[PDB]
Amino acid sequence: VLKKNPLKNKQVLLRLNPYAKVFAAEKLGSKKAEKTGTKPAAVFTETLKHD
């Protein structure tokens, strides 16, 4: 008879989507990605700085 909002009710956040439990646990929203090194060809940068 009174609609509780998830997103601010941890009780109703976990009454749907129980993965929220795990989610909070590994934090998952700050997850860092493996930093790679790939570089663009000089073409891409040459035409980017073109006139």
Partner: protein, 56 residues
């Protein structure tokens, strides 16, 4: 109208906060996964995040 390309985040926050079901019309507040499965369960989809999946 105004429109565009909803990211997952807003699709979730839409359905979570303001998502409601049509059941014999009636506009039922979702609030329990048991509701979705009762209707959209015939399609798969027994959870709200199952719904959000079939949307995005």
């Amino acid at each position: 109208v105004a429109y565009g390309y909803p990211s997952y985040s807003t699709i979730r926050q839409l359905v979570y906060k303001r998502g409601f079901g049509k059941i014999n019309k009636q506009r039922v507040p979702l609030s329990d996964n048991a509701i979705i499965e009762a209707n959209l369960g015939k399609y798969g989809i027994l959870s709200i995040d199952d719904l959000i999946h079939e949307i995005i």
